[PDB]
Write an enzyme that holds these catalytic residues in place. Sequence first.
Site, PDB file in Angstrom:
ATOM      1  N   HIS A  42       0.793  -1.236   0.000  1.00 10.03           N
ATOM      2  CA  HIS A  42       0.000   0.000   0.000  1.00 10.03           C
ATOM      3  C   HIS A  42       0.825   1.285   0.000  1.00 10.03           C
ATOM      4  O   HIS A  42       0.273   2.371  -0.243  1.00 10.03           O
ATOM      5  CB  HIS A  42      -1.074  -0.012   1.135  1.00 10.03           C
ATOM      6  CG  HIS A  42      -0.527   0.209   2.511  1.00 10.03           C
ATOM      7  ND1 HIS A  42      -0.281  -0.839   3.387  1.00 10.03           N
ATOM      8  CD2 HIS A  42      -0.257   1.349   3.205  1.00 10.03           C
ATOM      9  CE1 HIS A  42       0.165  -0.362   4.530  1.00 10.03           C
ATOM     10  NE2 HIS A  42       0.209   0.963   4.444  1.00 10.03           N
ATOM     11  N   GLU A  73       0.489  -8.110   0.973  1.00  8.97           N
ATOM     12  CA  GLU A  73       0.849  -6.750   1.369  1.00  8.97           C
ATOM     13  C   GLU A  73       2.369  -6.596   1.493  1.00  8.97           C
ATOM     14  O   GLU A  73       2.856  -5.671   2.138  1.00  8.97           O
ATOM     15  CB  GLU A  73       0.198  -6.287   2.685  1.00  8.97           C
ATOM     16  CG  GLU A  73      -0.943  -5.316   2.627  1.00  8.97           C
ATOM     17  CD  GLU A  73      -0.846  -4.167   1.634  1.00  8.97           C
ATOM     18  OE1 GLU A  73      -1.543  -4.303   0.622  1.00  8.97           O
ATOM     19  OE2 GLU A  73      -0.189  -3.136   1.945  1.00  8.97           O
ATOM     20  N   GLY A 147       2.151   6.098  11.763  1.00  8.75           N
ATOM     21  CA  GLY A 147       3.565   6.056  11.283  1.00  8.75           C
ATOM     22  C   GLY A 147       4.370   4.775  11.411  1.00  8.75           C
ATOM     23  O   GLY A 147       5.558   4.768  11.079  1.00  8.75           O
ATOM     24  N   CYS A 149       3.974   1.879   9.723  1.00 11.04           N
ATOM     25  CA  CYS A 149       4.033   0.966   8.599  1.00 11.04           C
ATOM     26  C   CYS A 149       5.436   0.689   8.032  1.00 11.04           C
ATOM     27  O   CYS A 149       6.291   1.573   7.873  1.00 11.04           O
ATOM     28  CB  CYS A 149       3.011   1.286   7.510  1.00 11.04           C
ATOM     29  SG  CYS A 149       1.326   0.788   8.115  1.00 11.04           S
TER      30      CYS A 149
HETATM   31  C1  LIG Z   1       0.495   2.392   7.890  1.00 11.52           C
HETATM   32  O1  LIG Z   1       0.632   2.809   6.634  1.00 11.52           O
HETATM   33  C2  LIG Z   1      -0.857   2.155   8.515  1.00 11.52           C
HETATM   34  C3  LIG Z   1      -0.761   1.747  10.024  1.00 11.52           C
HETATM   35  C4  LIG Z   1      -2.027   2.178  10.807  1.00 11.52           C
HETATM   36  C5  LIG Z   1      -2.176   1.609  12.194  1.00 11.52           C
HETATM   37  O2  LIG Z   1      -1.328   0.814  12.663  1.00 11.52           O
HETATM   38  N1  LIG Z   1      -3.288   2.094  12.819  1.00 11.52           N
HETATM   39  C6  LIG Z   1      -3.668   1.715  14.162  1.00 11.52           C
HETATM   40  C7  LIG Z   1      -4.089   3.067  12.042  1.00 11.52           C
HETATM   41  C8  LIG Z   1      -5.497   2.608  11.553  1.00 11.52           C
HETATM   42  C9  LIG Z   1      -5.571   2.223  10.038  1.00 11.52           C
HETATM   43  C10 LIG Z   1      -6.930   1.590   9.608  1.00 11.52           C
HETATM   44  C11 LIG Z   1      -6.773   0.261   8.811  1.00 11.52           C
HETATM   45  N2  LIG Z   1      -6.969  -0.883   9.689  1.00 11.52           N
HETATM   46  C12 LIG Z   1      -7.768  -1.908   9.326  1.00 11.52           C
HETATM   47  O3  LIG Z   1      -8.380  -1.965   8.277  1.00 11.52           O
HETATM   48  C13 LIG Z   1      -7.902  -3.048  10.246  1.00 11.52           C
HETATM   49  C14 LIG Z   1      -8.493  -4.331   9.881  1.00 11.52           C
HETATM   50  C15 LIG Z   1      -8.350  -4.974  11.028  1.00 11.52           C
HETATM   51  C16 LIG Z   1      -8.774  -6.384  11.319  1.00 11.52           C
HETATM   52  O4  LIG Z   1      -7.766  -4.277  11.997  1.00 11.52           O
HETATM   53  N3  LIG Z   1      -7.465  -3.007  11.438  1.00 11.52           N
HETATM   54  C17 LIG Z   1      -5.365   0.147   8.225  1.00 11.52           C
HETATM   55  O5  LIG Z   1      -4.537  -0.321   8.999  1.00 11.52           O
HETATM   56  N4  LIG Z   1      -4.969   0.518   6.972  1.00 11.52           N
HETATM   57  C18 LIG Z   1      -3.603   0.454   6.425  1.00 11.52           C
HETATM   58  C19 LIG Z   1      -3.459   0.834   4.931  1.00 11.52           C
HETATM   59  C20 LIG Z   1      -3.853  -0.254   3.936  1.00 11.52           C
HETATM   60  C21 LIG Z   1      -4.685   0.071   2.854  1.00 11.52           C
HETATM   61  C22 LIG Z   1      -5.061  -0.905   1.929  1.00 11.52           C
HETATM   62  C23 LIG Z   1      -4.599  -2.214   2.080  1.00 11.52           C
HETATM   63  F1  LIG Z   1      -4.948  -3.154   1.206  1.00 11.52           F
HETATM   64  C24 LIG Z   1      -3.755  -2.535   3.143  1.00 11.52           C
HETATM   65  C25 LIG Z   1      -3.379  -1.556   4.070  1.00 11.52           C
HETATM   66  C26 LIG Z   1      -2.820   1.448   7.231  1.00 11.52           C
HETATM   67  O6  LIG Z   1      -3.332   2.555   7.349  1.00 11.52           O
HETATM   68  N5  LIG Z   1      -1.608   1.145   7.752  1.00 11.52           N
END
Ligand SMILES: *[C@@H](O)[C@@H]1CCC(=O)N(C)CCCC[C@H](NC(=O)c2cc(C)on2)C(=O)N[C@@H](Cc2ccc(F)cc2)C(=O)N1
EC number: 3.4.22.29
Length: 182
Positions: A42, A73, A147, A149
């Site tokens: 992503h 991913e 931050g 990721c």
């Molecule tokens: C880093 O780029 C980021 C880390 C975010 C993180 O750790 N956090 C607590 C922020 C919330 C982000 C909301 C999304 N979470 C979920 O969807 C989720 C599912 C479950 C079971 O638990 N949480 C999320 O993490 N999105 C990531 C981006 C992403 C977009 C598209 C994809 F196909 C894969 C990842 C993200 O924001 N990561």
Amino acid sequence: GSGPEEEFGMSLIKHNSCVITTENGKFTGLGVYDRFVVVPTHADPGKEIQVDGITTKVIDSYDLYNKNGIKLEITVLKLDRNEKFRDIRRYIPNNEDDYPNCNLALLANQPEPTIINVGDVVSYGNILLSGNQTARMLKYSYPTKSGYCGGVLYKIGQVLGIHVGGNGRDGFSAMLLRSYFT
Ligand SMILES: *[C@@H](O)[C@@H]1CCC(=O)N(C)CCCC[C@H](NC(=O)c2cc(C)on2)C(=O)N[C@@H](Cc2ccc(F)cc2)C(=O)N1
């Protein structure tokens, strides 16, 4: 920690991590060996990225998938740069597993290299990550932040995964397996 688990992580940061900048922001990149780095898919790296602020051509890239075509991913990039990463493949597990007492090693978006104790990790299967099916997840109960990721999930002598997301209570890494790189 200031003992061996923290110390292995700091060495990993220093020798095998970098900050990767794309149009989607800054990610911790894991250098696996030579000019190969992994980042979360992503991050959407294009033909040029920044590696620690230096504009760098991507010689090739490819996304990984499970047996049914579901994204892992993880994206592998081969970088046009002189520096070679120390080979850490022998620290990457062969198989899916659960792991007690793991840490996350963070570089991008932090004021300094940071090591976080995320606790016990389980192989969790497939999840929906921002609505998209994602396979071979490792789950931990820690309040991860935006931050984090690309952050490297590890234990002493074991490089386990890269942080891809979370919900404020649980955090998820993409599993690293040695066969991806061999
Ligand atoms: C880093 O780029 C980021 C880390 C975010 C993180 O750790 N956090 C607590 C922020 C919330 C982000 C909301 C999304 N979470 C979920 O969807 C989720 C599912 C479950 C079971 O638990 N949480 C999320 O993490 N999105 C990531 C981006 C992403 C977009 C598209 C994809 F196909 C894969 C990842 C993200 O924001 N990561």
